[PDB]
Symmetry: D2
């Protein structure tokens, strides 16, 4: 039969016999995502242009408010906020959420695909809630995923049961399950990085990309795609296979992408989908964060592709 | 004051004192575009998935455009990416314009939900002969109007005409195109370069060289960022908004490029030139090319003028 | 072949070879109506209720602003404004528009169908446009109709060429031509009036209604329907046939409905559709207004039904 | 704090500490209602008119399929289907659902308000599920309500915690709690019935209505309203108070409205709001049904108004 996101989550939660909190958080998040989708598609823009006589802030406000009021959260970390948000005592629940409410928005002016990326942890320590509760390795993720506001809006949700993709049907405002237990290709034909940083690349990265353009065994070169918007680039990587890279430009040394709410969620999605995600040195999901907005290098995608890069990384030691 | 596409056009048309065919054609088109936009954002998909118990998007999009154009009484010859021959409008529906269009550009990668778009170029039919394929064989210089609908984070229609380039945001709450950016002009020089670097092994050495200088400037300037969506409407629209350069050039394996002249290159070239940008094949302005085939390919390097002029410096260097 | 409101009006205007000014007005009002529909259906209500942490006024503002900026109007009469709005000289066109922007909205609280009613005249005096340009008998109407915000949104447009009905497809925000050159049934099976005012009725109304319930020719009695929203009641009258009545009572001794922006447009639509519209004493469209918020009584509908009523009104002298 | 239907119900569900089945059911019903609303507002109608070159049926399909696939139901009664639908064993839950998927659909061609009515029971026998399970008096209702597709879409949900009203925001496809624990007025000023069938009225109904229009004291008559679609008339009755009647007579000894999926749900909502619902002889919720499609007379609304009706009824019995 047809399924929706909310119902899919309920049936999985009923199965697991949990208290409903995660389902409440997820339903709340999905309401925020639909409100973000609507704003992003410029619903009501006419009224802003005088018909009757901020988007990242709005999106942040939407997710913060939906999550605070879900009663399922205690600590909230956002790209938009300098410090962690500690939910008021009355609204505290057992989950910690790290999110980027509108990823890729700094270039929304060219109507590039944007998205919301999120990572859900259970609060691990019994101490009073604090920024420290978001400082868990990605391995500790209970659920993660993203809404892509692309040609269409899709919510990708990763949990222990696997990766499932839900398309927003805007006619009824419902997320419809369209891809079940998603697995990424073992190897793709596309590579994805900002090559304008060629000048700064590792010997490892440079040689790997070199192999994609000029394969040693005369095979067809990988095609190149780089939207410049992480959720868009990562989604294609899931759907089509291949590799996405945002390495340290030795000139911006800890990577550019944020660990808690960009790298981890996607690494989690990748791994649940049979993919891999590395910093080069260790699994993304194994980094023990010390800071909520800390950055990481990230290379992710099909396992044969990522493995191929790690072989190159290791030749260069 | 608020303005909309239809009403922007009607006003421009009354100032021009025309008969109304172009306004009628353009209103038909933007209706098709709102239908394509609704389809692309997957309205009604729940019903494909059995909520209550067929045409691909590029096909539906072609039928939307063809139908609304044929029924506009403003067109006589229609060239589409989807159709082998030019469609000749039936005598009772014939009007004065020839429209060349790609109904869903970038469609082959619509599965990853990358931005897609509709590209159109509108010509006045130039002779009184019985309409045929030849009516579409005009250089881009002859365009009366051109542009694109980009189905991205939001849907935007960009219309180029003699009065310049105007950007219209689709408000899906009311299905109106709202004028948001007027008389748009591109930056003289940008900081972004756009092409598929994966096929570098097939590059023309001048392309190889130009792109190297973007990544390794011999002058202490910051290197250019790279962006490549792989969707022409998306890539060209970023190029318009932020400046810089977009390349789909010729090589040995493809001496005439990959992109189609009539309904991909010419409309984008026209928008670009109206915006103070440039569009070249390497050998001449894309708008100066005389087509001999409606599905004729051309190379296209377009964008900010200083960037395009710089590519031409290197291109010449390789003869 | 498919048609839309805007393109319908364009080809009609093209045929009449006019200056496009009427088309421009109608397209602007079209846009206002879609904006009104969206607000009536409560798009964005979540924002009012705190998701991110007056309808009749808005409707007036939408109609006012779009018509002013159409460059096609000079005088604007609304149920919402005590006086005619005189368009600033830079925006003046040749048409007078009388409209009720959200007819039936005092009861919008129960989700009753509401509507927008409009009538369009050519201005009269080469002088200043003035409140007096709106003071024309309905017979002088260039165009009239309504948008009904019912179970679906429909725009009914009456002009010289007849009455045409357009359904708003909310998926693409376009008015689709669904009913061409509509003609009302010669006689219906439904009557429509507020019978709560029975105690106040003149004897003619009393006898006519009594005939609908207790037919003298022993035929089937007429059904009763009264939404209490003129647009809804008149639309049903148009589609199904029958009769709509708003006669005089003690609280409303010259009727309750406003001549300029309720009765005339509906009368004009009725007449163009082969129905009738009388005040009892005369054709609604023959009444010369002396005030812009002047009230008139109205009996309208299928020709036989309205004739039958006039013959009873005739009897009671 | 903003609240949504699904979250409100989840929160009430977690408070009751139930298994989640009712929440699952109500969420699935909620989705079908959104799909009904979209179809009813005519989304996609441009495609029926050849832009690219049912409603009662579709609504029935939507509700049935959403309910079957919910894993919450065992027996489904629809106005549309003679026999109860017995859900397959692999899809079986504990609830019996009685519904009218599109009330007032006959008169959808004039775009007047339509609605969806539902009543939800717990299966009480340990027998194999069968029609007999739907044969419970309204007093056994676990939940009941309706969606009205009027000028906006609203879902009214009555449960043991009372009556809550949720507006659909079409921009995001969410039911937003807008009226909490609603209570009906003790006495209203409107009466609602088809007065075109006066010749066939019960003498008690004739007298009651005569009293509303010509009150024996000097006092002001009631207004009359009759949309002719039960959901619209009952909802106005809920919002503004007064009385709705679809009573019995000698030609219709059991009235014409359906007990299980019309009268019961509205009686339940009415009673939970502090109003009354009667057949004249007993409470609607007290009738033991012997047939899933049986009719009941129904008089409902403000208690003072129903009480006054019943005093007249007792004068003629
Ligand atoms: C995969 C998953 C999802 C949710 C959960 S959960 O939140 O901890 N539990 C839970 O939802 N329980 C329910 N009971 C009744 C309903 Br309806 S939902 C656990 C695992
Ligand atoms: C820039 C431009 C656009 C359209 C045209 S057009 O189609 O040839 N003319 C035209 O529309 N004239 C009108 N008449 C009345 C109305 Br309303 S619009 C010309 C120039
Ligand atoms: C029935 C009717 C409608 C409009 C008019 S009108 O406004 O006075 N003229 C007019 O529209 N002319 C045009 N022709 C082509 C276009 Br595009 S617009 C007249 C009659
Ligand atoms: C008023 C009412 C509503 C629902 C129910 S219910 O369905 O039987 N229980 C239930 O939902 N329990 C939940 N637990 C966790 C979640 Br999320 S939902 C009971 C009472």
């Amino acid at each position: 039969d047809v399924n929706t996101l909310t119902r899919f989550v309920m049936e999985e939660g009923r199965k697991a016999r949990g208290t409903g909190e995660l389902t409440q958080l997820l339903n709340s998040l999905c309401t925020a995502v639909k409100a973000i989708s609507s704003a992003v598609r410029k619903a009501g823009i006419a009224h802003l242009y005088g018909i009757a006589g901020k988007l990242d802030v709005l999106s942040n406000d939407l997710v913060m408010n939906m999550l605070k009021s879900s009663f399922a959260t205690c600590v909230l970390v956002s790209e938009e906020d300098k410090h962690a948000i500690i939910v008021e005592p009355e609204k505290r629940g057992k989950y910690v959420v790290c999110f980027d409410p509108l990823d890729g928005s700094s270039n929304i002016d060219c109507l590039v695909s944007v998205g919301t990326i999120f990572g859900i942890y259970r609060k691990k320590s019994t101490d009073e809630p604090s920024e420290k509760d978001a400082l868990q390795p990605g391995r500790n993720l209970v659920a993660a995923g993203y809404a892509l506001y692309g040609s269409a809006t899709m919510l990708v949700l990763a949990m222990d049961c696997g990766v499932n993709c839900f398309m927003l049907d805007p006619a009824i405002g419902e997320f419809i399950l369209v891809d079940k237990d998603v697995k990424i290709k073992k190897k793709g034909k596309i590579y994805s990085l900002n090559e304008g940083y060629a000048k700064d690349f590792d010997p490892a990265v440079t040689e790997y990309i070199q192999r994609k353009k000029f394969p040693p065994d005369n095979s067809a070169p990988y095609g190149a795609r780089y939207v410049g918007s992480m959720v868009a680039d990562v989604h294609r990587t899931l759907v089509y296979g291949g590799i996405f890279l945002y390495p340290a430009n030795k000139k911006s040394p800890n990577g550019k992408l944020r660990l808690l709410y960009e790298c981890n969620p996607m690494a989690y999605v990748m791994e649940k989908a049979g993919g891999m995600a590395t910093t080069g040195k260790e699994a993304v999901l194994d980094v023990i964060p010390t800071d909520i907005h800390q950055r990481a290098p990230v290379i992710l995608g099909s396992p044969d592709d990522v493995l191929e890069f790690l072989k190159v990384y290791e030749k260069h030691s």
